[PDB]
């Protein structure tokens, strides 16, 4: 029983964190096998970030312009190249702690664990969701660039995010491990701003199912609703439009609890219109949207209290 | 930059988790050097919990009765004993991944990270607090027994919790690493239940300081209050009584912000009596009580391990 915003164990990722320095800038790098991945802006000086031409700035560097350190030990870079917004540094030795892994680009609404690091050392781990607007509401301080987001399936680590910057509102932006930004953001100092955001409807529904699985159903009702009728209401509350695909995804959860998806949508509709009246769901006073249906199934019992 | 309730990196602990099987009962064990620690009820069965005599039950067991598995390797048990509510199994191999560590008994209100494990395999990690009523609001499923709670100091891991059971309200109970339960709970079938719980005032105050440190300070005012007047109000909202010791524990934060603890109490009093008026503190609509004064400094400063 119980329900927490839990992250994946971070050990497999901790063993891949290193420090990367160029000039006076230092940040984190991801060391897999004989390669180290890090934000390309590590090569930028103060004035460079205003309007940097990375191709021009990088061609002026050599392998020895980069100082990679695993702990206090230096790793000799024997090659370098740029891949979109990331730098790929080849080193003269392999990381024996490299776990089975793959590079994946996630979709907004999905969740992942983040191992916040500073100077190549782990600070903490937390779970979050990529907002529909591609930003993440993380906890990063200066020097956290290069920290990565990931998910773990069995013993295979799927890296999906590398931290690059913080926007005006205090939210964060980054890229996948191929160096491609999530969102319209760019790695330079400009008037960038997070776009409009919405609540991840699919996740809120998944969360309501988690509550039922855990024995609570005070928010249910005798009504049902049309997908369209639900969206007409939900969209008024800044909720992401729900599609048939989302409904289908909730199938397993629906089957385990005996509550039809549209019936749960009817419950959510009522919660949005009438509020929670001082009550709580899984200990929360607000509707949580950082748990995907997959997260709920993974954390909750396969058998509902009843 | 945001404020997230985060857990300690779990790598050092993951390397110590193993599976302990006894007959049809399987749970998790903590392998440090050549000893594996796990809940003693691993020598029980469904019926064995409703009235155990661990003393007698353990006698019918010998070294080969215990199967310890670390990864895909079998750890040969060469000795065994019981320490309070724990089983101590001596194995023929000292864990190559044993970190610097210590066993500590946490106090009510203090937090720690929990590494949920099943069949010796870590599945997730989350932060939680030892509630004033001696239970923890964790997330555990069958097979999680043996999972541990911990804190990290530089390079030293302080183990403070080992999971043993779930109470009727869905909350959890366990022991320190010496096998002594937190609270009055026992590893047996009884009518035991969690008592009433209160909000951890010390932590709520620590969190308000965190908010201030992060620039969220709209709730501060130019007044103060006596400790007694604060408690008269706080206790009406089911908050733990604030003690002079708590005030002193908040000293570093108070010094850092230049806001006296009692001045912060005045702020909190107003928040409890008038609410937030639709405002947010560190993006939250409620007062968080699972961040200790130590967690705040840790996260606001860039402490790494």
What is the DSSP annotation of B62-88? -GGGEEEEETTEEE-EEEEEEETTEEE
Structure tokens at B216: 């969220």
Nearest-angstrom CA–CA distance, A39 and B117: 34
Q: Is A137 on the interface with B (CB under 8 A)?
A: yes
Q: How was this structure determined?
A: X-ray
Q: Is B299 on the interface with A (CB under 8 A)?
A: yes
Structure tokens at A176: 């996948």
Query: Domains (ranges, CATH) in chain A?
Result: 1-14+100-197 (2.40.10.10), 15-99 (2.40.10.10), 198-301 (1.10.1840.10)
Name the residue among A147, A146, A148, A287 with its Cα closest to residue A208: A287
Q: What does DSSP say about strands A17-22 and A25-32: parallel, antiparallel, or unpaired? A: antiparallel
Catalytic residue flag (residue B145): yes
| Catalytic residue of the set B16, B38, B41, B160 | B41
Considering CB atoms only, which of B9, B123, B170 is closest to A14? B9
Q: Do B125 and A125 touch (CB under 8 A)?
A: yes
Nearest-angstrom CA–CA distance, A66 and A40: 12
Report DSSP state, residue A10: -
Q: Is B4 on the interface with A (CB under 8 A)?
A: yes
Q: Are B86 and B37 in contact (CB under 8 A)?
A: yes
CB contacts, 8 Å: A3 with chain B? 139
- Resolution of this entry in Å? 1.9
Q: Do B7 and A123 touch (CB under 8 A)?
A: no
- Planar angle of CA B259, B250, B203, nearest 5 degrees: 110
In sequence order, the 6+-apart residues with CB closer than 8 A to the CB of A227 are A242, A243, A244, A247, A262, A265
Q: Do B305 and A121 touch (CB under 8 A)?
A: yes
- CA B302 to chain CA centroid, Å, is 22
Nearest-angstrom CA–CA distance, A258 and B286: 32
Q: Do A9 and B7 touch (CB under 8 A)?
A: no
Nearest-angstrom CA–CA distance, A298 and A261: 19
CB contacts, 8 Å: A299 with chain B? 124, 139
Residue A82, CB-side half-sphere exposure with 13 Å CA sphere: 17
Considering CB atoms only, which of B9, B14, B140 is closest to A124? B9
Considering CB atoms only, which of B126, B170, B286 is closest to A285? B286
Which residue stretches of chain B are H helix?
11-14, 54-59, 201-213, 227-234, 244-249, 251-257, 261-274, 293-300
Q: Are A20 and A35 in contact (CB under 8 A)?
A: no
Q: Are B129 and B136 in contact (CB under 8 A)?
A: yes
CB contacts, 8 Å: A300 with chain B? 141
Nearest-angstrom CA–CA distance, A88 and A77: 10
Q: Which residue has tokens 């909202």? A: B237
């Amino acid at each position: 029983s119980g329900f927490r915003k839990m992250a994946f164990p971070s050990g497999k990722v901790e063993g891949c964190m290193v420090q990367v320095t160029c000039g006076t800038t230092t940040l984190n790098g991801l060391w897999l096998d004989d390669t180290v991945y890090c934000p390309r802006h590590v090569i930028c000086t103060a004035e460079d970030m205003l309007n940097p031409n990375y191709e021009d700035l990088l061609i002026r560097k050599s392998n020895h312009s980069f100082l990679v350190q695993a702990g206090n030990v230096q790793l000799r870079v024997i090659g370098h190249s740029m891949q979109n917004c990331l730098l790929r540094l080849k080193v003269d030795t392999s990381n024996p702690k490299t776990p089975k892994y793959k590079f994946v680009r996630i979709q907004p609404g999905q969740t992942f664990s983040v191992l916040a690091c500073y100077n190549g050392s782990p600070s903490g781990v937390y779970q979050c969701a990529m907002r529909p607007n591609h930003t993440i509401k993380g906890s990063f301080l200066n020097g956290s660039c290069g920290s990565v987001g990931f998910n773990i399936d069995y013993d295979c680590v799927s890296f999906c995010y590398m931290h690059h910057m913080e926007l005006p509102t205090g939210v964060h932006a980054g890229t996948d491990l191929e160096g491609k930004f999530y969102g319209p953001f760019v790695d330079r100092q400009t008037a960038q701003a997070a776009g409009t955001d919405t609540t991840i409807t699919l996740n809120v529904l998944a969360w309501l199912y988690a509550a039922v699985i855990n024995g609570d159903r005070w928010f249910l009702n005798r009504f049902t609703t049309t997908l369209n009728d639900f969206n007409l209401v939900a969209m008024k509350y800044n909720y992401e439009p729900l599609t048939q695909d989302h409904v289908d995804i909730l199938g397993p959860l629906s089957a385990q609890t005996g509550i039809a998806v549209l019936d749960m949508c009817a419950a959510l509709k009522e919660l949005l219109q009438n509020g929670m009246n001082g009550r709580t769901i899984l200990g929360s006073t607000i509707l949580e949207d950082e748990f995907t249906p997959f997260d709920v199934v993974r954390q909750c019992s396969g058998v509902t209290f009843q």
